[PDB]
Symmetry: C3
Subunit: 145 residues, 3 copies
């Protein structure tokens, strides 16, 4: 999946971003079994005051996670995943949960490319990996922590 | 909902951003009935020259709006709102309509979190808002302009 | 279509961006027939280090294309188009295929506005442009490369 994380500039230090990226990555691997290296976290920083709530300009304490997934999981699994993201980014970023927004959008795995390869169904995770070339396997292998 | 409003850096003064955000928020509120505070407007600024139309580099005048909504509303209603966003953004931004792009994506409410809580089905924001903790209500309430 | 393209700051020089804009715009028109000027390429730059893969922070060699489309095309065509963007951006940007991620999202044309007007169903692009205003037709026509 790809997790677009829209935050205010400076509100997360490189350590906070790294903690937030780990929290979302570990939450996703935890509840879906998709390997670590398959989860992208992409911070989009914008100066404070670019976020408006009900027409009201905001300071730098808003966090909007927009997760982009493949289709095929149950509404229940997706509920738990968004809740665990909320709780684990609140902790990792030292921000209160009311400041956190989370949207999941889904697409067919047939129109999703990661590491230049079409993604498999969530009922295909392990077999897809074993049938990748060894140069690709190794390169993905590096993006784990 | 969340509205990602993609624009050129320095195209909009703080008050024009303010005017655009209010124009989108009242629009959405006017047409769906969902409470003011529920709508987020998130301005993403990029240097001018980052937008290509038909391969042609553009100036600072493009406006893309990506509205992320809950599933459940009719096509006639959704068109009404997008047409209205083009018109009132054009005024609030003093920018010609021909520059305005508006896309609406939808997601099950069950996978959408705002202020750390899951959203109700559309048309049900009344009860949902009453069953929130009093602290969450109060925080939300202050986000009405 | 709108192609949100997420890259690190200064990874793509102005010519490099034009090259990536071109490969994306030409692959899309080349496979669906839809007129050149109707494709937006929007570059979202962020400082290097804001991309994490599997929790590991990245340098500046990551590319995420998020493609926003009208509904109505086949998985077959959507597949060929995604593969062609990977191939044509790896060449245009001078980056290994393993670094390009491409997601396609779909929306009913009826909730999509380009140049301030609703889009047609994919099987109607010719006689839709034939009912646009002079200025509109003229406007879009200048953004052909």
């Amino acid at each position: 999946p790809v997790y677009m994380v829209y935050v205010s500039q400076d509100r997360l230090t490189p350590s906070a971003k790294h903690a937030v990226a780990k929290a979302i990555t570990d939450a996703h691997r935890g509840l879906t079994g998709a390997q670590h290296f398959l989860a992208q976290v992409n911070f989009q920083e914008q100066p404070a005051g670019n976020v408006f709530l009900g027409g009201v300009q905001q300071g730098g304490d808003t966090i909007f996670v927009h997760g982009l997934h493949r289709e095929g999981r149950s509404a229940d699994l997706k509920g738990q995943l968004a809740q665990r993201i909320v709780d684990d980014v609140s902790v990792a970023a030292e921000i209160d949960r009311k400041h956190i927004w989370v949207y999941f959008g889904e697409m067919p795995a047939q129109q999703m490319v990661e590491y230049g390869r079409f993604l498999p169904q969530p009922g295909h995770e392990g077999e897809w990996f074993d049938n990748l070339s060894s140069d690709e396997r190794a390169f993905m292998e590096t993006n784990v922590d």
